[PDB]
Structure 1
Amino acid sequence: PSPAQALASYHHFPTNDQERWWEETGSLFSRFLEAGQYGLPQQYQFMFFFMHHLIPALGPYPQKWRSTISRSGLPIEFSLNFQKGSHRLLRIGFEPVSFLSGSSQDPFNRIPITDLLNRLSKLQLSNFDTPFFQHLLSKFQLSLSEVRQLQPLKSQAAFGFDFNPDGAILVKGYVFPYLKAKAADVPVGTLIAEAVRTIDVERNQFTHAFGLINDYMQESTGYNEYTFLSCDFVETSEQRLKIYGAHTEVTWAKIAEMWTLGGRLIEEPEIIAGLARLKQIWSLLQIIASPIIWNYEIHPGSRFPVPKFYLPVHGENDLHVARALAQFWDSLGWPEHACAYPDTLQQLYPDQDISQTTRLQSWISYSYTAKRGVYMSVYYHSQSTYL
């Protein structure tokens, strides 16, 4: 059996809500810790964190709230990031929920966000600052706008957790400006740009790269309801703000157009390299429906954005995807990651049979760097009951 869930033996979950969430996701998270090749102390250490801070935050077990972050809508999903031979890392995307979420007292779920954010500040966490994130929230609050609004997707922020191989967690926060933009009847990008600009006199290090993205977005009508924003919980210097968006139907040409941001960054050799490898997968993988997602990461020092795409897998035979996914690793030359992948997939879902499963894996992310190589992460069915 899988190990880290040994802690619960001498723990009593206060509410029935929590007990049911534990039963729904407890084992599953323990398995990803195992599949993440984490040190046994670290496994229990993050297991500890999961129980105390995330299980309370899931809210009522029979969940009444759909979270924007998941295809299915439940407030959590688990991620594995694969690297060049180093190993794999585990990722959690979170949207705090309570019984008030979606109700008269909090129809758009701001309350749990601020609650959870104080738990985290209470925990003695390395390099944990909130100002930048506070800034974006303030930029997107509502008030009397709620009243307008009350007369789709309702969540207004989200969280992310990266458990690095060291026993350290890194906290990632999201912001969904669709609500704020819709209430003011102002195009999303106009306030996104103005939101980015408002931090520019605060420090003008994102102007170049962003204005470079905002131009391509306005060219291509890339901005839409689905566009949203991201950031890290740390000192501004080391912070990486990210802009996400989606497109309903996308061809390879459109993908190349976006990956090169029009033609903005054909000059950089990295992108050209990154785009080549990308079509190798595009061919493996796909060889009313879910959209494809894109990402532009604005490291502050640099002059260009770094792209990243998210590719729908739910709807594709999770075995075909495991197979093709493994073929692509040999092409890159990852010895252990490609050989033991599909065995690692069944060991996460022993109840299910990959031969016939489709929803078990939902997204794949692609990034490329000269230094790192090929970033790539897989997003999974993150509960233990499958329809």
Structure 2
Amino acid sequence: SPSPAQALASYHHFPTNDQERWWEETGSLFSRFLEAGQYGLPQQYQFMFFFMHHLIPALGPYPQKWRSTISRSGLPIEFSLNFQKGSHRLLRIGFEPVSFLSGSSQDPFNRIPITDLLNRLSKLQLSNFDTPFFQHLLSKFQLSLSEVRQLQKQGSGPDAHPLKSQAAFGFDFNPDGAILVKGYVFPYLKAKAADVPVGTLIAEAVRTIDVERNQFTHAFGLINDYMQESTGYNEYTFLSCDFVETSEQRLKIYGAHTEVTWAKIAEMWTLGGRLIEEPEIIAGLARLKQIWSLLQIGEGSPIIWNYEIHPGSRFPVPKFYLPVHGENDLHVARALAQFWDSLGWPEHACAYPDTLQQLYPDQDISQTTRLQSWISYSYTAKRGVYMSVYYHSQST
């Protein structure tokens, strides 16, 4: 009758008041996603063990002080379920390490906990875990006594407090006994200090690795061209990375817009170049139109975007993120369940709203809006339809 995987904590003493108190906040919920993800029972205890030892210490002060970037609310963790064509669902963790020094004189922009977690991650003997590529992006996006101007930017009159993080993490739990670790970099602060357009140094970040190896040039240079033509990738734009070897690496470019017209959604997904040359973009966009209409956003909608550059191709796979905070979680659960019948997905369609009340039995799906925050869409020829749902990740 209770959630199963959380019985490891029975014989564990959390050394600090900070950790025991966070466990009390998220340990229950994480055990429920492992049950939802249908992971092997021995698998769930492995990922629990990792969660207790590396992420609980990394949350830092329980009454938190850091406003994280990766989460809508600000708390430094969010959980996600990756829904895949006719196959077991997966679990995504993206979170930012924090300590009591975060936001202080010593580390006003959370650089220290990032490398603290990254050192433990390397100590963990992880299959095919290589840091050279992510380390390159930090070296480009570090800041020296740019901090002084950043300390100076804190003006109430001139709003200069959108985001303060400088990097973050992501953890994917595949059904095998493996974590793929995914890392993030946030250029707003480095460009804010240099008085240089946010995207201009994103290109150099890619070009500096281009002289190292030059397989991202074509795919990326095509992204810049649209973003220069467009309103432009702005303060909210940022970057992603995988901690795997470079040849297998899949780097991404994120960004945000408040412009919500279907025409603009078509303008970004298609742009110019990628429309003609491949059918997936066209095929995927069609299926993207029906979820846009299934999820009536109630105004008749600011969105995040993503282009996934892979070296083994010259066609970046687009991915968009969709507002569900503000939309009824049942309306979305119902409407999101229909879209699986439209694609012909056998079980996920029927058991999702019953796997949604199961994840939050305390709360009432009738009245909740914030239990579901964002939805991602991606389309590949081989993979079919990618789609992941980001949830409310704290119990309170």
- The 8 Å contact of residues 257 and 263 in structure 1, kept in 2 or not, is answered as no
CA drift of 1:304 comes to 1.4
- Residue 264 of structure 1, CA deviation: 4.0
Q: What's the CA shift string for 1:100-147, capped at 9, x where partnerless? A: 000101000000000000000000000000000000000011111001
Q: CA deviation at 1:222?
A: 2.4
CA contact (8 A) 1:292 1:309 kept: yes
CA-to-partner distance for each residue in 1:194-231, whole Å, 9 max, x for gaps?
Answer: 11000001111000000000000000022100000001
Contact 2:26-2:393 at 8 Å conserved across structures: yes
Q: Are the counterparts in 2 of residues 149 and 183 from structure 1 also a CA contact under 8 Å?
A: yes
- Provide the secondary structure at the position in 2 that maps to 1:265: helix
Shift of 1:263: 4.9
Cα distance change of structure 1 residues 382 and 22 upon mapping to structure 2, 3 Å threshold:
same
Check whether the contact 1:265–1:304 (CA below 8 A) recurs between aligned residues.
no
Query: Secondary structure of the equivalent of 1:225?
Result: coil
| SS at structure 2 position matched to 1:355 | coil
Q: Secondary structure at the match of 2:105?
A: coil
**Residues in 2 aligned to 1:122 and 1:60: alpha-carbon distance in whole angstroms:** 24
Contact in 1 for aligned 2:249/2:310 (Cα 8 Å): yes
Instruction: Check whether the contact 1:222–1:247 (CA below 8 A) recurs between aligned residues.
Output: no
Checking the alignment, whether the CA contact within 8 Å between 1:200 and 1:207 is kept in structure 2 is yes
1:260-317 deviation digits (Å, cap 9, x = unpaired): 1245433311110000000010000126x96200000000121111100000101000
* 1:235 and 2:245 matched: yes
Per-residue deviation, residues 238-275 of structure 1 (Å, max 9, x unmatched): 00010001111220000011001245433311110000
Partner of 2:108: helix, strand, or coil? Answer: coil
In structure 1, what is the Cα distance between the partners aligned to 2:108 and 2:301? 26
Is the partner of 2:92 in helix, strand or coil? strand
Q: In the alignment, which residue of structure 1 is the partner of 2:155? A: none
Structure 1 residues 74 and 290, CA gap change in structure 2 (3 angstroms)? farther
Gap change, CA 1:110 and 1:61, over 3 Å in 2:
same
* Structure 2 residue aligned with 1:198: 208
Larger mean Cα displacement after TM superposition, 148-157 or 358-367: 148-157
8 Å contact kept, 2:260–2:301:
no
Q: CA deviation at 1:167?
A: 1.1
What CA distance in whole angstroms lies between the structure 2 residues aligned with 1:4 and 1:47?
Answer: 7
Native 8 Å contact 2:275 2:282 kept in 1: no
CA distance in 2, matches of 1:290, 1:134: 35
Q: Provide the residue aligned with 1:336 in structure 2.
A: 347
- 262-271 or 44-53, which deviates more: 262-271
- Give the equivalent residue in structure 2 for 1:244: 254
Instruction: Compute the displacement of 1:188 (Å).
Output: 1.0
Aligned to 1:369: 380
8 Å CA contact 2:60, 2:99 repeated in 1: yes
The whole-number CA distance in structure 2 between the counterparts of 1:291 and 1:270 is 25
**Bigger shift: 43-52 or 300-309?**
300-309
Asked whether the 8 Å contact 1:96–1:112 carries over to 2, the reply is: yes
Contact 1:222–1:245, Cα closer than 8 Å, also in 2: no
Does the CA-based 8 Å contact 1:162-1:169 persist in structure 2?
A: yes
- Superimposed CA distance per residue, residues 68-116 of structure 1 (whole angstroms, 9 cap, x where no aligned partner): 1101000000000011111100000110000000010100000000000
Q: Distance in 1 between matches of 2:327 and 2:232?
A: 26
> Is the contact made by 1:76 and 1:382 (CA closer than 8 Å) also made in structure 2?
yes
Structure 1: runs of 5 or more not aligned: none
**Distance of aligned partners of 1:152 and 1:200 in 2 relative to their CA distance in 1, 3 Å threshold:** same
* Separation (CA, whole Å) in 1 of partners of 2:232 and 2:51: 36
* CA-to-aligned-CA distance 1:170-202 (integer Å, 9 cap, x gap): 100000011000100000111000110000011
Q: TM-score, normalised by structure 1?
A: 0.98
Q: In the alignment, does 2:135 pair up with 1:125?
A: no
**SS of corresponding position for 1:139:** helix
Which segment is superposed worse, 85-94 or 255-264? 255-264
CA–CA distance in structure 1, aligned partners of residues 376 and 100 of structure 2: 33
- Are 1:64 and 2:65 matched, yes or no? yes
RMSD over aligned Cα atoms = 1.3
* 1:347-381 deviation line (CA, Å, top 9, x unaligned): 00000000000000000000001111000000000
Q: Indicate the SS of the match to 1:254.
A: helix
Q: Give the structure 2 partner of residue 80 of structure 1.
A: 81
The 10-residue stretch of structure 1 (31-40 or 215-224) with the greater mean CA deviation from structure 2:
215-224
Q: Tell me the distance in 1 between the aligned counterparts of 2:115 and 2:271.
A: 35
**Secondary structure in 1 matching 2:48:** helix
1:217 aligned onto 2:218: no
Query: 1:67 touches 1:75 (CA, 8 Å); kept in 2?
Result: yes
Q: Distance in 1 between matches of 2:260 and 2:208?
A: 33
CA contact (8 A) 2:274 2:281 kept: no
> TM-score, length-normalised on structure 2?
0.96
Q: Residues 33-48 of structure 1 correspond to what in structure 2 (within 5 A)?
A: 33-48=34-49
| SS state at 2:311 partner | coil
The share of aligned pairs that are identical, in percent, is 99
Match of 1:10 in 2: 11
1:309 match: secondary structure: strand
Residue 179 of structure 2 corresponds to residue 178 of structure 1: no
1:267 and 2:277 are equivalent in the alignment: yes
CA drift at 1:12 = 0.3
